[PDB]
């Protein structure tokens, strides 16, 4: 059976087993139960299932490897597809809670989920509860007796745990660190020198490395039983690395990527994000071209908008990217190569993530 | 050692326990940790802690019977104080979530988190989040070699999950249920044929009792590992019995209850809810009083409000709650007598928490 398909298959097992559940145990009515099944659908289906189809394709690599009975190879990717799926509906959480604390206005062409008529901010607050606490329920109940369960629960609370630290960062790296206080309102930077390398690195760890790169990679691992198989260290190093670079190509496309393409209008330099264009243009600036950032960053006017996008053209960062992609490439293949000493199955698997990355 | 101060000097190693990890695991800053610091103490302190304290109610009730080593008394007991705040760390969650979701403006006399000058609700929704991931970063940390933790986990997540069902009933209690359209917007009911005794159970149930009063008193039992000393179908009989209670009490205070005891101005009937008073009301008018209603119900205007506090006070609700009161304590007692059957002690823990809830 192809992977995509038996992975759609099991969102509908799993849809199904949710409702189900909330008739026989949680006295739900069929209208809210309708009501449920749609925002489900809304929030979690539609995007490429990137994540989610890591942890199918990992365990597919050992499969291919490894002696099994039949049922056996079953049980492995049925159990990576519902792990899989613990992992969208997690995003599908945060994109939607983020989507609300961000006023966000579209997401992949469609209104967000908090902008639907008929749900608004007070009813998508408590769904994006809903999407997080579905992850434990269908852990608890697929993984119940597997020998993995501990350790997969443990290592996703930590990437949820992470994940939120992360947006903490994100929502607070535009401010000045020793000014932060919750009884004060919080001023835009002047100075913009917490723009640097090592704290955009620290914002994109957090927020969407763990949950993007490195719970998908060891969750494959977990339901295959193969942890013990790798470099935990080099896991981790490589899911860090591996998942900077795709922030820093979302950061690129937020400016310079149509929105009819994009999915929304990008709207970082309003925000006054730590995005990867700014920290690279303060990088290399010299003065006047730092005071005519300043004077025009953080602000809704279009013209003060459309004076940092030419800052950026000018500057041409598109070779800075170039600089950085060649560094990464290097970066990776050396992880690659060092996977390979304990697994040449992992490290495949690794390197189609990498080119499945690099060529989006 | 008395209870509460035991119970407040773990609130002051679990926080120290939290914020030592993010810096040594999560790479936070000091000022970031300051804030989070100050927004556990704002969030999770200033209660009454009934719930957490329920906890070691209920394990201090099983030592004085079982036979212990000194030191496994303190262990029990120190478990307890992490469950407790546990629960406590949960219903923090829900309030600051609750009062971004409702538009609330106090809590307890102060302003709701998200009003906080350098919160507003773009860092608050996401710090509510990270209230309920430190439930589980507290109990993986203290409970690791638990034998209880598998069971604790799986009730946690359980009882988190009702929570936010019982909210999705609560949020929509105003709307016909077979109106509900993720696509249109939402009118208020102008039957209210939903108003029912049955349906304002369910919203009670699943809302708070479950997180309220079942999940307190079934950790106690787990921390005692003494689960398999009571009839569980009693207990949940009982916790949704007294929890019921609870809200009703709560009900009747947003209408009557000064704002200034209060702690906040009551708007239930601004907001279309479906209450105690307005099922109990709707359940004994004749058919001139229930079209007031309906031409007042769910409406700002302070002239309509007043409309409906005035047919409540005429209908002499005060006295269906004495009838219901007095069925309470009827059927509580009933039940405090079934689970001495199999528990003296923790029938009297029960008998404790009813006196406590009674007597609020
Ligand atoms: O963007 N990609 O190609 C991705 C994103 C996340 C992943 O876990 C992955 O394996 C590929
Ligand atoms: O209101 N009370 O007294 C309460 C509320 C919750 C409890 O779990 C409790 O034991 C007492
Ligand atoms: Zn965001
Ligand atoms: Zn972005
Ligand atoms: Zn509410
Ligand atoms: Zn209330």
Known sequence: MASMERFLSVYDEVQAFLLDQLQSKYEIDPNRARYLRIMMDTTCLGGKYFRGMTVVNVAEGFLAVTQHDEATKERILHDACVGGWMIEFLQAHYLVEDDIMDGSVMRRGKPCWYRFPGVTTQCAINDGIILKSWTQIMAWHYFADRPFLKDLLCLFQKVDYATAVGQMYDVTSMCDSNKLDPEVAQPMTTDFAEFTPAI???????????????????????????????????????????????????????????????????????????????????????????????????????????????????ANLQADFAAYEAEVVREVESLIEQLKVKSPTFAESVAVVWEKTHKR
């Open 200 to 314: 955009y690195k620290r914002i994109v760890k957090y927020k969407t490395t763990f949950y993007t790169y490195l719970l998908p990679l060891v969750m494959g691992l977990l339901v295959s039983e193969a942890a013990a198989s790798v470099e935990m260290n080099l896991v981790e190093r490589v899911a860090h690395l591996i998942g900077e670079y795709f922030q820093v190509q979302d950061d690129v496309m937020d400016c310079f990527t149509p929105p009819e393409q994009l999915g929304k209008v990008g709207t970082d330099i309003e925000d006054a994000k730590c995005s990867w264009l700014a920290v690279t243009f303060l990088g290399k600036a010299n003065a006047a071209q730092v005071a005519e950032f300043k004077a025009n960053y953080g602000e809704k006017d279009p013209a003060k908008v459309a004076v940092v996008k030419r800052l950026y053209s000018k």
